[PDB]
Design a protein around this ligand. Structure first.
Ligand SMILES: CCCCCCCCCCCCCCCCOC(=O)CCCCCCC
Ligand SMILES: CCCCCCCCCCCCCCCCOC(=O)CCCCCCC
Lengths: 194, 194
């Protein structure tokens, strides 16, 4: 039943491009997937469950991509190392704006969404801290702020800043400038002595 | 009618300390202020309007405080200059956690709240950019990223990071460490050459 489940997912991601989940019905998702309404309930308990699955797929895709970089570094300087890591998130979520927006708006009423985001953020923060620590160990970065607290703030900045740019918020950094903006902040705060 | 209006405001801020606005009724606010329910509607059209006023008071208090610092600098180094500026927000909103939380949760359904926050953020971003520019003009800070884009990201980081700390989110920087964390990121990214 992958086809019909994927068809429900694709339909949902497509519609979420024009309106919020609240304005999307199970029938819409059903008609979109070419199945009946009761048959939808065979794959998902609710439309909120569909969005959750969508976010879970986007989140894991970014995580897997980062995992790929971890295993296969890249012959380049330290500035580029961080840029490639940040780019994983700019590109993954930037290629799924509708789901990112819907996912954010869902956090307020979905503990599933909240816990999913929280778990990976902790995961991405722990990795950033490990890289910073490794960087400090080799003598490249000065031992300034506690690595994990620095990593948390930088990660929270990206979460908020990338979202603002993807959503075209007021205020926000233009999407065409956001990667460079974040990379500079990460690089100066990680290697800066003061 | 200041007394009764202020009594409605105080009552609301007090209750918001234990539960969300949704779990607070106009009667609660009414009983809390020692007036009847219909008399409440004499000062505010709704409870959502009360929270808006509360946020507006907290936002302006921070703005006025920053304005005071602008007019009356402080004989100290550049690192301390930024710390005092950031402290205005850490202290003002940190002394009104309930209203800050409620205010954030209200943004999703209140354009009044959204526009209020947006207007001052733009204002605080413009000021940060002016200081950065002044700093660059005098030769203290290197001309790296466009000042306004750097200012936007730093401000968005504070908004997200301070909120996470005040709310005790997972993940978050402990409140007792957040000021230092942010000041370091601001200082290194503003004066850092690379
Ligand atoms: C070697 C280099 C390492 C680089 C690590 C980079 C890690 C940064 C991870 C944080 C950024 C995540 C991108 C988020 C974009 C918009 O996020 C939305 O918020 C998603 C919706 C989820 C709901 C939760 C809302 C608080
Ligand atoms: C000379 C030094 C200048 C320093 C300037 C510092 C400016 C930083 C201003 C941004 C931080 C604001 C603090 C926010 C704390 C939590 O915010 C909540 O979000 C409030 C609720 C409002 C709802 C909107 C949610 C996006």
């Amino acid at each position: 039943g992958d086809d019909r489940e994927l068809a429900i997912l694709a339909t949902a991601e497509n519609l979420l491009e024009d309106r919020p989940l609240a304005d999307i019905s199970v029938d819409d998702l059903a008609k979109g997937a070419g199945i009946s309404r009761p048959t939808f309930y065979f794959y998902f308990p609710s439309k909120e469950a569909v969005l959750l699955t969508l976010l879970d797929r986007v989140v894991n895709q970014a995580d897997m991509a980062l995992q790929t970089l971890a295993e296969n570094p890249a012959d380049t300087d330290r500035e580029n190392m961080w840029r490639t890591g940040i780019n994983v998130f700019f590109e993954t979520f930037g290629s799924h704006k509708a789901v990112t927006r819907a996912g954010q708006a869902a956090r307020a009423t979905s503990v599933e969404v909240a816990e999913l985001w929280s778990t990976f953020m902790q995961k991405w923060i722990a990795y950033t801290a490990a890289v910073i620590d490794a960087e400090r160990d080799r003598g490249a970065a000065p031992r300034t702020l506690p690595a994990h607290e620095l990593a948390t703030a930088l990660n929270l900045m990206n979460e908020r800043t990338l979202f603002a740019s993807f959503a075209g918020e007021q205020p926000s950094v233009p999407e065409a400038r956001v990667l460079d903006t974040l990379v500079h902040i990460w690089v100066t705060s990680i290697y800066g002595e003061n």
